[PDB]
Amino acid sequence: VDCTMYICGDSTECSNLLLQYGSFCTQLNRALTGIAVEQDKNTQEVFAQ
């Protein structure tokens, strides 16, 4: 999920305002990427033996 797009989208005023919330979007994106990588990790561990 794109945090900036989901919260604001194409609008620019909302995107500018959201910068006041620090790096919550970055943290959420990092967590989602970690989960996505972990999915492939589990798939490989279970199947690629």
Binding site: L17, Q20, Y21, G22, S23, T26, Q27
Partner: protein, 175 residues
């Protein structure tokens, strides 16, 4: 393990070399030869003091963990698995290898004839870990990644104070 076992200085293991794993008094610390490389490779460190952050030292210091590891090592060497189930009944390593060969499904003879080559192969394999760890920085991946994740999470938490969250300013005193 409830007791701290030790290896007699003779260390007559019939060609099996435990220098890499057993404690090394030569170094300032009592940790084994391999341990030093692992700690050096593993080691935003000691730079979190502001904003009320504090770190509690672990209950079991590194020296205590090394002592526990050395005790487990000594128990495994002489007593094999016997000390993990009762009294530490010492058995020669040359014959402990034969006893284990029986568990997997190999007769004690194979070892009783090939002991020299078996010990040489064991020493080479255990001794080759040093070079592999030294030449490869990804061998300690898990600990490095978890430490980096914790460090970056703490850094992000600290930096969050720099965001006003829609307020006029990010400093209470200025407001």
């Amino acid at each position: 393990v409830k007791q701290i076992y030790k290896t007699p200085p003779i260390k007559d293991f019939g060609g099996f070399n435990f220098s890499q794993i057993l404690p090394d008094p030569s170094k300032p610390s009592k940790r084994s030869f391999i341990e030093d490389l692992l700690f050096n490779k593993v080691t935003l460190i000691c730079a979190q003091k502001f904003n009320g952050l504090t770190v509690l030292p672990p209950l079991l210091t590194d020296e205590m963990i090394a002592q526990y590891t050395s005790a487990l090592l000594a128990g495994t060497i002489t007593s094999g698995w016997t000390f993990g189930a009762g009294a530490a009944l010492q058995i020669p390593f040359a014959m402990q290898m034969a006893y284990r060969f029986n568990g997997i499904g190999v007769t004690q003879n194979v070892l009783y004839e090939n002991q020299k080559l078996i010990a040489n192969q064991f020493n080479s394999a255990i001794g080759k870990i040093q070079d592999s760890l030294s030449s490869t920085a990804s061998a300690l991946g898990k600990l490095q990644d978890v430490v980096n994740q914790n460090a970056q999470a703490l850094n992000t938490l600290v930096k969050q104070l720099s965001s006003n969250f829609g307020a006029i300013s990010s400093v209470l005193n200025d407001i």
